[PDB]
Amino acid sequence: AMQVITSVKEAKQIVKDWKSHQLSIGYVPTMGFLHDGHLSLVKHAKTQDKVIVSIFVNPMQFGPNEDFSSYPRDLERDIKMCQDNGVDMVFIPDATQMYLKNFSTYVDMNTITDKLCGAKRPGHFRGVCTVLTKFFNILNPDIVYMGQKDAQQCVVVRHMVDDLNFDLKIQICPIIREEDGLAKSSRNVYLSKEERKASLAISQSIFLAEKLVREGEKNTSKIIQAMKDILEKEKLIKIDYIELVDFNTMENIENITDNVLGAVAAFVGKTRLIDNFLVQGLK
Amino acid sequence: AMQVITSVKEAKQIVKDWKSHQLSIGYVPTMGFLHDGHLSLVKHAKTQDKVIVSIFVNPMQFGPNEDFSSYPRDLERDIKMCQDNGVDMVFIPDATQMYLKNFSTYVDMNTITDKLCGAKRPGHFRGVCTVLTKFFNILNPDIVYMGQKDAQQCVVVRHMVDDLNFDLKIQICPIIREEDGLAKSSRNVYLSKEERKASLAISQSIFLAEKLVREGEKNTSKIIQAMKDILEKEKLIKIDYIELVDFNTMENIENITDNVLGAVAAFVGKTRLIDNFLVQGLK
Ligand SMILES: [Cl-]
Ligand SMILES: [Cl-]
Ligand SMILES: [Mg+2]
Ligand SMILES: [Mg+2]
């Protein structure tokens, strides 16, 4: 029967026992209120012998001005979806298990995190790096499955893993979308009917930019303007950024050569949404 | 035959194979030019099935004003001592293996490291935390043996291990001393005959402070003055700090209750030496 584990000590024991049987471990870190995007990561993780999903709304990666208190939470919904989709262990620690009274250590970095959302969200990537170092040490996974939707986060965590010699692989999985094109996110639940309609311009701008790139358009300023024109038609949308950047460095690019990450962040009403497309190996 | 390993990849392989046989691993991180202090850590580590010594003069933990370029180095001496003392693997990576071109991640903390040497050596503990996270991830040790001589470092690393959930134990081992009382350190090799004679006042001040404490002296200002009087007799000695602090927090203490770390840092000529005593469980 699937284990629902709230203790670090017990999670360690279970993983240690699985390792005693030379079983591989697939790990899907999440902040709960699960959706088909998460289920897609789980499906990939089932290539491994055992699958772990963590659920933890990590307070370190939210700032004071953001949505920690309202973040959607429904642990019964999540347990059921993990149960129905063949998850072996749902690890749901609370902040008192993860961060003891005198906790004071962190993991951070001096490149990558200063761009895109990192520039808009001070402290965010330190929160991500620190909590994932902890989870990786607790759970000892072999492959960690992450969504391309958080593209910068994937690159940041990959770089941390490289730099700190974590003996595991980060596997980036494609963006899963709603029927109407909106990238799956737990924050979608915040949107009003009218905001939901407005929010489709984000994915529209992504589909168009990707088509332009694959049709051989190299000038990023041309592409950005085209996305901007789509997004500016929606009064409910306030653009945070639209940037085409190198996928490995997050540095803005003026002319596309081998690759591009085209990334958008925008507020739809008060809700902050992100989306992107990624093209690699261009001639 | 003992393995001398310069590659991360090969070190990983060897450790993975040992683990496939359920062997425990004892690890002694060092910066080489080995002495009896190190040999003592190795002796403790031999409680484990396999013993690893790393040798790496980690550039991250030295500042511009310190002694990175002159740090004693004699890898043939070290290999022989490891060989003769039953070490299984000497891991000697170079900075190009550990720190690749675009390396930019670090581990640091917001308590403990701001006191004692930490205050005198900006960036030092970040260098220690970061390189040890890497070694721990590479070598997957069960117990890591460290000398009490670097008492703050032991407490810092213990706290990192706790906070980041490293699945290992830090074992602090007592100070090994020269016949004349000077705490063993590779930096002792820098001392002139006259500096060596002067340097004995450091251990003398430690022996006296510990005797005063164990004789029931609680007033730290009295104890510090007594140490200061010994040290001020030596013209070649410039005191950096003399502090009696709580062993768990590194906070200065005015009146001793259950514990005390009495720590000294002083320059003898240009060489910076440290020493301490530790008393725990007092009534
Ligand atoms: Cl989400
Ligand atoms: Cl030394
Ligand atoms: Mg592993
Ligand atoms: Mg281990």
DSSP assignment of A225-282, as one string?
HHHHHHHTT-TTEEEEEEEEE-TTT--B-SB-SS-EEEEEEEEETTEEEEEEEEE---
Pair (A15, A142) in one structural domain: yes
Residues of B in contact with A8 (CB under 8 A): 165
Please give the Cα distance from A124 to A113 (Å, whole number): 9
Residue B8 inside a domain? The answer is yes
Residue A222 inside a domain? The answer is yes
Residues of A in contact with B142 (CB under 8 A): none
Closest Cα partner for A52 from A30, A77, A74? A30
Starting from the CA of residue A147, give the closest ligand.
Answer: 1
For residue B157, give the chain A residue with the closest CA: A105
First to last CA, chain A: 50
Q: Helices (DSSP H) in chain B: which residue ranges?
A: 8-19, 36-45, 75-84, 95-98, 116-120, 124-139, 151-163, 193-214, 220-231
**Is residue B125 within 8 angstroms of chain A, CB to CB?**
no
List b or e across B49-88, with b for residues whose CB sees 16 or more CB atoms inside 10 angstroms: ebbbbbbbbbebbbeeeeeeeebbeeeeebbebbeebebb
First to last CA, chain B: 50
The last residue of a domain, from among A123, A144, A177: A177
Please give the Cα distance from B136 to B62 (Å, whole number): 20
The last residue of a domain, from among A177, A200, A225: A177
CATH number, domain with residue B243: 3.30.1300.10
Strands A260-268 vs A237-245: parallel, antiparallel or unpaired = antiparallel
Starting from the CA of residue A22, give the closest ligand.
Answer: 3
**Is residue B102 within 8 angstroms of chain A, CB to CB?**
yes
Query: Mutation test of the interface with chain A: which of B21, B128, B163, B248, choosing the one with the most A Cβ atoms within 10 A?
Result: B163
Pair (A164, A132) in one structural domain: yes
Q: Which of B21, B38, B44, B124 is catalytic?
A: B38
Report how far apart, in Å, the C-alpha atoms of A92 and of each of A3, A5, A13, A68 are.
10, 6, 15, 17
Residue A282 inside a domain? The answer is no
For B:150-179, CB contacts with A below 8 A are 159-160, 162-167
Closest Cα partner for B126 from A3, A111, A265, A109? A109
Please give the Cα distance from A31 to A54 (Å, whole number): 8
**Is residue B12 within 8 angstroms of chain A, CB to CB?**
yes
Q: Contact, B280 vs B256, CB < 8 A?
A: no
Neighbours of B266 (CB within 10 A): 23
Provide the token pair at A87: 């998850």
**How many structural domains compose chain A?**
2
Provide the token pair at A23: 């079983």
Closest Cα partner for A94 from A75, A79, A77? A75
The Å distance, Cα B25 to ligand 4 centre, comes to 9
Report how far apart, in Å, the C-alpha atoms of B87 and of each of A202, B66, B83, B177 are.
60, 30, 6, 22
| CA-angle at B127, arms to B123 and B133, nearest 5° | 145
CB contact under 8 A, B105 and A166: no
Starting from the CA of residue A29, give the closest ligand.
Answer: 1
Q: Which DSSP letter does residue B59 get? A: G
**Is residue A107 within 8 angstroms of chain B, CB to CB?**
yes
Out of B100, B133, B167, the one facing A12 most closely (by C-beta) is B167
Pair (A28, A151) in one structural domain: yes
Name the residue range of residue B123's domain. 3-177
Pair (B200, B160) in one structural domain: no
The residue type found at A138 is: I
Q: Where does residue B172 fall: left (phi above 0), alpha (psi -120 to 50 degrees), or beta otherwise?
A: beta
Starting from the CA of residue A190, give the closest ligand.
Answer: 1
Please give the Cα distance from A63 to A43 (Å, whole number): 32
Please give the Cα distance from B221 to B261 (Å, whole number): 14
Quick one: CA torsion of A227, A230, A235, A241, rounded to 10 degrees? -10
Beta-strand ranges (E) seen in chain A are: 3-5, 25-30, 50-55, 89-91, 105-109, 143-147, 169-173, 237-245, 260-268, 271-279
- In sequence order, what DSSP letters do the residues of A188-210 get, joined into one string? GGG--HHHHHHHHHHHHHHHHHH
Q: What is the 3-state secondary structure (H, E, C) of A261-275?
A: EEEEEEEECCEEEEE
Pair (A153, A197) in one structural domain: no
User: Is B38 an annotated catalytic residue?
Assistant: yes
Length of chain B (residues): 283
Residue B283 inside a domain? The answer is no
CB contact under 8 A, A165 and B100: no
Pair (B11, B131) in one structural domain: yes
Report how far apart, in Å, the C-alpha atoms of B174 and of each of A35, B44, B48 are.
54, 11, 19
Provide the token pair at B272: 């910076």
Please give the Cα distance from B272 to B210 (Å, whole number): 22
Quick one: CA torsion of A227, A233, A237, A241, rounded to 10 degrees? 20
Resolution of the model in angstroms: 1.9
Query: Mutation test of the interface with chain A: which of B164, B166, B251, choosing the one with the most A Cβ atoms within 10 A?
Result: B164
Pair (B166, B218) in one structural domain: no
For residue B131, give the chain A residue with the closest CA: A164
Q: Where does residue B209 fall: left (phi above 0), alpha (psi -120 to 50 degrees), or beta otherwise?
A: alpha
Residue A143 inside a domain? The answer is yes
The last residue of a domain, from among A177, A194, A210: A177
Please give the Cα distance from A14 to B106 (Å, whole number): 30
Please give the Cα distance from B126 to B106 (Å, whole number): 7
Please give the Cα distance from B130 to B107 (Å, whole number): 5
Q: Contact, A52 vs A34, CB < 8 A?
A: no
Neighbours of A76 (CB within 10 A): 7
Provide the token pair at A266: 């925008």
Residue A270 inside a domain? The answer is yes
Q: Which DSSP letter does residue B68 get? A: T
Q: Contact, B49 vs B25, CB < 8 A?
A: yes
- The side-by-side arrangement of strands in the sheet containing B143-147 is B3-5, B89-91, B50-55, B25-30, B143-147, B169-173
Pair (A168, A185) in one structural domain: no
Q: Which of A21, A38, A124, A159 is catalytic?
A: A38
Q: How many angstroms away from the CA of B164 is the closest CA of chain A?
A: 5
Q: How many CA atoms lie within 13 A of B200 on its CB side?
A: 10
Please give the Cα distance from B114 to A172 (Å, whole number): 38
Pair (A182, A170) in one structural domain: no
Q: How many angstroms away from the CA of A127 is the closest CA of chain B?
A: 12
Q: Contact, B59 vs B68, CB < 8 A?
A: yes
Closest Cα partner for B160 from A226, A130, A22, A61? A130
**Is residue A137 within 8 angstroms of chain B, CB to CB?**
yes
- φ, ψ of residue B204 to 5 degrees: the values are -55, -45
Pair (B165, B198) in one structural domain: no
Residue A102 inside a domain? The answer is yes
Q: How many angstroms away from the CA of A234 is the closest CA of chain B?
A: 39
Q: Contact, B199 vs B191, CB < 8 A?
A: yes
Decide: residue A141, CB within 10 A, 0-12 exposed, 13-18 middle, 19+ buried: buried
Residue B48 inside a domain? The answer is yes
Out of A107, A108, A165, the one facing B8 most closely (by C-beta) is A165
Q: Where does residue B76 fall: left (phi above 0), alpha (psi -120 to 50 degrees), or beta otherwise?
A: alpha
Neighbours of B172 (CB within 10 A): 18
The Å distance, Cα B24 to ligand 4 centre, comes to 9
A61 known member of a binding site: yes
Pair (A153, A55) in one structural domain: yes
- φ, ψ of residue A62 to 5 degrees: the values are -110, 145
Q: Residues of B within the annotated binding site? A: 31-38, 61, 147-150, 153, 176, 184-187
Q: How many angstroms away from the CA of A150 is the closest CA of chain B?
A: 19
Report how far apart, in Å, the C-alpha atoms of A44 and of each of A28, A174, A256, B203 are.
10, 11, 31, 60
Q: How many angstroms away from the CA of B226 is the closest CA of chain A?
A: 34
Strands A25-30 vs A143-147: parallel, antiparallel or unpaired = parallel
CB contact under 8 A, A167 and B140: yes
SS3 category, A127: helix
Provide the token pair at B170: 């830090």
CB contact under 8 A, B100 and A162: yes
- φ, ψ of residue A157 to 5 degrees: the values are -70, -40
Report how far apart, in Å, the C-alpha atoms of A281 and of each of A247, A258, A259, A278 are.
11, 5, 6, 10
CATH number, domain with residue B36: 3.40.50.620
Q: Can you tell me which residue has the tokens 């088909």?
A: A36
Q: Contact, B67 vs B75, CB < 8 A?
A: no
Strands A89-91 vs A105-109: parallel, antiparallel or unpaired = unpaired
Cα radius of gyration (chain B): 19
Q: Contact, B186 vs B71, CB < 8 A?
A: yes
**Is residue B133 within 8 angstroms of chain A, CB to CB?**
yes
Report how far apart, in Å, the C-alpha atoms of B55 and of each of B52, B71, B125, B193 are.
10, 13, 18, 28
Pair (A127, A256) in one structural domain: no
Length of chain A (residues): 283
What number of H helices and E strands is found in chain A?
9, 10
CB proximity list for A132: less than 8 A, separation 6 or greater: A29, A144, A157, A160
- φ, ψ of residue B184 to 5 degrees: the values are -55, 135
- φ, ψ of residue A208 to 5 degrees: the values are -70, -45
